[PDB]
Amino acid sequence: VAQGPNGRALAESMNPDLLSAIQQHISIERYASVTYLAMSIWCAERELAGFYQFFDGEAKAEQSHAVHFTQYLIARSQSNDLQTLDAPRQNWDSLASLMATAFQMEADTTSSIQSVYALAERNSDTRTTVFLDPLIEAQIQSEDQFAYLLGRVKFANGDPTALLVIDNELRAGQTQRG
Amino acid sequence: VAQGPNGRALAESMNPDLLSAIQQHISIERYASVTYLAMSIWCAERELAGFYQFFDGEAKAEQSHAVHFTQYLIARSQSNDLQTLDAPRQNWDSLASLMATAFQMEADTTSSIQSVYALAERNSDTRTTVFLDPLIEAQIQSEDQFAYLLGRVKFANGDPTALLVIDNELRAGQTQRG
Amino acid sequence: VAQGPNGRALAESMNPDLLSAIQQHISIERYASVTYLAMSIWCAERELAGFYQFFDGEAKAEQSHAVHFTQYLIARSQSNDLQTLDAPRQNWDSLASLMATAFQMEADTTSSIQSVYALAERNSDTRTTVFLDPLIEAQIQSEDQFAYLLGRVKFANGDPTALLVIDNELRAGQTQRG
Amino acid sequence: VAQGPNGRALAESMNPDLLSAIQQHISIERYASVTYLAMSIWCAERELAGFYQFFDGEAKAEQSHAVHFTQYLIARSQSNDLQTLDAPRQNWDSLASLMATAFQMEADTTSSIQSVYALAERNSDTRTTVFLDPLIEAQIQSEDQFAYLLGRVKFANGDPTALLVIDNELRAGQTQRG
Ligand SMILES: [Cl-]
Ligand SMILES: [Cl-]
Ligand SMILES: [Cl-]
Ligand SMILES: [Cl-]
Ligand SMILES: [Fe+3]
Ligand SMILES: [Fe+3]
Ligand SMILES: [Fe+3]
Ligand SMILES: [Fe+3]
Ligand SMILES: [Fe+3]
Ligand SMILES: [Fe+3]
Ligand SMILES: [Fe+3]
Ligand SMILES: [Fe+3]
Ligand SMILES: [Fe+3]
């Protein structure tokens, strides 16, 4: 039995380019987390309490995704390398602009997973594609959700009254098309 | 005991013009179904989640009506003839315009039933008028409901804020005058 | 943030050939639905009440699959295009012949999904392959089930007594090997 | 306030031809009852216990229908005239032949109601057509049921094994397509 790079028994070696890609993706998840924390704060500063609660929960979710990836590297007997984390964006001129950045962040998180996925397929790493499959499925739902929130905010067309109604929807947990 | 056109024992023969009219009406119910599916999609594309859920349920209801009619033909020992189904309308410039088409569809579904009803009376087919009576009663309630939804949307006068409020009413199941 | 063809925020563009393939597959699901409705009617006309109830439920299931696909296109910000629906086959000389057509319909539904799947892989659309994966899994179970029902009916070898026994199995919900 | 023919206060006079038709129809219901009693006995004599129980219940149901009509005449302040009741048919060469007579009896019961209905319409007696409407609706279901039982017995094609299976269905209360 061979020992993997993190010292555990090694079921199958991993290509170092794929390992690097996964470690980089963990940073993307962590960056999504702190971005949604920053967005939660921006909403709280403007008394948009429902948006604040929504993004507070999304920040915790993205962090859980990052940890989920660290556990996969442990399971593959690969080293983790937790990286320096950039400061998030923190300023937006409107809720519509913030929601566009949020949608972009969600789509970019998926693109990162897709990049890892393609590298795994190039290396015939079926453990990794199987690991990522349900995460891509979750991303489809999150992209649908963030498209819904962005589209509903854009529909409001900057009217504070409509934004208050949507804010109350989010406080109630009405965050998807259903 | 005589055998009817579908091969079952025949309680009473049916005029072929009435049979044709019922088969055509089943197509109307099926077309109402796919129309409401198309409307559900149009609303979902615009984040009108309550309208989407409402029309999704109406599509399933209209399909159940179609099946209910197929069961009546079975009960009368008459042949069913499931027909080619036209594509629905799929594009509207506004929710008010979509709701006008929906009301029209509901009224036209009733007109079709009325046409079958008159033909049954001309043929003294009291089984068929009795079968249709509760369906007309249901249509009165559906016309009242669709007049309510259309009128409430028109009252909004294209204001997104008001349309969001109504959308949330529909998500909550508040779809009638009560 | 770019807007997709249906107007929603676009997470990732979709190849138009893949979009066309998905829209066509939705028609296949809808056609499976109306085919099973026709089969339910054929069984009801011959007092095969258990087969009638089984196919009535399968018709509703296939319709739900079609809607599930329309929701995926909404989620991908792609246009839906609900198509004209052919009339189903409606005449069979025996239950064994009907069950052969049903098995074929189920296998052909899978082949359609496989065709979409291959096109998605050619376009590196991992959202779509992930979306389809559980549907293929469900198809394996449905093919196994329909092979079971067809094989059990063929075993009966046209004996009405055996077909009545199987009919009662289906009425009871005993529709699979277990 | 005028007194009707049975001595009660009279809400609206009834045409004597319509009264005679209703009194005659009550005899039809009573004759259906004793016919199903005779059929129950024929089945019991051949150990067809499920058919015996089914027809025993149908005999009681038809009697309840007769009483329901006597109550309507009381409500209309009209005289009842309970008539001599013919002996039922009591001999059949096969269960299939008995079931054909049963279906005929059910259809003939509906034809009698239809005859009363047409006479009421000729006399603009809307109380009577309203009274009969739900009874015709029930007749549609009973005709569908008796077509189902007859068709299932004919499918058995005289095989005792199949007839025993159907007999057990009826004992269990499985008497309709569902
Ligand atoms: Cl805004
Ligand atoms: Cl509008
Ligand atoms: Cl067969
Ligand atoms: Cl027989
Ligand atoms: Fe994530
Ligand atoms: Fe995310
Ligand atoms: Fe309808
Ligand atoms: Fe309708
Ligand atoms: Fe009525
Ligand atoms: Fe399907
Ligand atoms: Fe299927
Ligand atoms: Fe009766
Ligand atoms: Fe009866």
mmCIF file with all atom_site columns, C-alpha atoms and ligand atoms in Angstrom, chain A residues 29 62 65 109 139, ligand 5:
data_model
loop_
_atom_site.group_PDB
_atom_site.id
_atom_site.type_symbol
_atom_site.label_atom_id
_atom_site.label_alt_id
_atom_site.label_comp_id
_atom_site.label_asym_id
_atom_site.label_entity_id
_atom_site.label_seq_id
_atom_site.pdbx_PDB_ins_code
_atom_site.Cartn_x
_atom_site.Cartn_y
_atom_site.Cartn_z
_atom_site.occupancy
_atom_site.B_iso_or_equiv
_atom_site.pdbx_formal_charge
_atom_site.auth_seq_id
_atom_site.auth_comp_id
_atom_site.auth_asym_id
_atom_site.auth_atom_id
_atom_site.pdbx_PDB_model_num
ATOM   1 C  CA . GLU A 1 29  ? -15.759 28.684 -2.860 1.00 0.00 ? 29  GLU A CA 1
ATOM   2 C  CA . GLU A 1 62  ? -20.407 28.501 0.264  1.00 0.00 ? 62  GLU A CA 1
ATOM   3 C  CA . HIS A 1 65  ? -18.951 23.790 0.026  1.00 0.00 ? 65  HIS A CA 1
ATOM   4 C  CA . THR A 1 109 ? -18.379 29.182 -9.260 1.00 0.00 ? 109 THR A CA 1
ATOM   5 C  CA . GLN A 1 139 ? -25.278 24.792 -9.107 1.00 0.00 ? 139 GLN A CA 1
HETATM 6 FE FE . FE  E 2 .   ? -20.407 26.817 -3.751 1.00 0.00 ? 5   FE  E FE 1
#
